[PDB]
Amino acid sequence: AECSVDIQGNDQMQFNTNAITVDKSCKQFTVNLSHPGNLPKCVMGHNWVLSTAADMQGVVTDGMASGLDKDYLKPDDSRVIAHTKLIGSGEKDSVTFDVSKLKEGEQYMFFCTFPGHSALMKGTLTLK
Amino acid sequence: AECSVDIQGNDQMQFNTNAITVDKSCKQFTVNLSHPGNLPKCVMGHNWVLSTAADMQGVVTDGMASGLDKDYLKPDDSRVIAHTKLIGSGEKDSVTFDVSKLKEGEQYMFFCTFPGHSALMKGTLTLK
Amino acid sequence: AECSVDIQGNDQMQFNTNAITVDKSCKQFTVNLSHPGNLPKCVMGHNWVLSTAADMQGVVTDGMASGLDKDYLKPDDSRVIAHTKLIGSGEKDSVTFDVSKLKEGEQYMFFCTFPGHSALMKGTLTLK
Amino acid sequence: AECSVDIQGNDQMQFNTNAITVDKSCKQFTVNLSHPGNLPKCVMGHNWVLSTAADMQGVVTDGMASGLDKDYLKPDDSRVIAHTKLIGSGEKDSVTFDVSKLKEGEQYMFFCTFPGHSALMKGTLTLK
Ligand SMILES: [Cu+2]
Ligand SMILES: [Cu+2]
Ligand SMILES: [Cu+2]
Numbered sequence A, B, C, D: 001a002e003c004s005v006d007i008q009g010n011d012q013m014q015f016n017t018n019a020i021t022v023d024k025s026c027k028q029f030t031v032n033l034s035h036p037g038n039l040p041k042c043v044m045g046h047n048w049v050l051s052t053a054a055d056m057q058g059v060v061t062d063g064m065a066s067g068l069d070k071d072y073l074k075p076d077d078s079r080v081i082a083h084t085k086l087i088g089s090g091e092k093d094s095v096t097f098d099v100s101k102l103k104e105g106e107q108y109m110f111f112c113t114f115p116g117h118s119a120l121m122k123g124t125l126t127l128k
């Protein structure tokens, strides 16, 4: 729609898209994450995390150490522009953030920080 | 069978077993690893690494640093009692080691050193 | 010891005992549950739930419906005399209850409410 | 624009142009590489490497041996005038170099050092 996107994470460890475009006219953007799979949060938990291409590796590495309890995210990680919680099969979650936090020109990557998933579950977010 | 076990690592990031039992009457034990998945060594490559429960973390951390070229294994890591190579979809590999290297009473863990997989891909190997 | 018992739930879906005896002289009894397995709460979680033999089936069925979030227990289930929480690999939990709640002569059963586990995970708790 | 060019490498293993013209009036030149594909750095990763036509074969052959960890480029290869990183699907990267390094009259070749890609991924860079 406008200023919002519907994204899914399945048991095949994939997002149903790898490119999100945020319209500059939007004050804020909304990401709706859903898990149409069957596997529970331990095995196939997904979340949606946004940050600069430069910070991904960092977030992913620290998230893994945080553990399942912390939704595989370092508490109050400054590198994380926005994020949903870790959801499992059948669950759902959404997050809205201020388009202002994004700065035209830079590279933005979204991905799941569940151990091993960033390998396949990642994509670019562009501010056009 | 006797003195050998068949183990699999799939695209869902899991081993098809988490407990292996090595009979003391065996002079050597063989582990046959196979990858019935579809994803390439890249994203979902697996391996089977054996070590003491105490050394797991150490091995996992250093392997990650060694990189995909090194099969996510520190070259000549003394803590590794035995290991297969990193295999991808459709591939296969095996490794035989001398049961003597195992000392009854201690704790042994087997796991995959591919970045993130240890979270779920790991089990206990016991000498009975 | 006296007025306390140490019980375990492993990955093989089994308790390390199927009979518990509560001495009448005890004012209260304590159960210490521990999970020596490797599998996470999703797949191989366990809890220790006590009730009359007659209510077990009822508790198990409703517990299943309550879902993982509720520790596979119907909230405020009156048929439940005592219970630990659902624990996964490496975790631990304990519960102490008043021996008074038990009434000599009746039949008591303890079991795990995680889906499918009550088939093997259950035992009798006697007041001698 | 002026003193910069936008180039692409897709999943079909091709550059969106095989000729780049650098204006001598430029002090330095900028190449912006983007990967509009879907395949990961792993299978369809690309990079932009500049060198004399005479050196290409050498760079490609050694870059291949360096491995994926090295971005398929021998470390500190003197034959490489300039280069971007090895990028995957959705990623992006740029490299700026001093036009001075180029010497009018000689032949310059750009290409991707990913195993096999040089067959189709290469072009000429002229200093006019
Ligand atoms: Cu995920
Ligand atoms: Cu693996
Ligand atoms: Cu259980």
Ligand SMILES: [Cu+2]
Pocket: D009, D013, D044, D045, D046, D047, D112, D113, D114, D117, D121
């Ligand atoms: Cu290429």
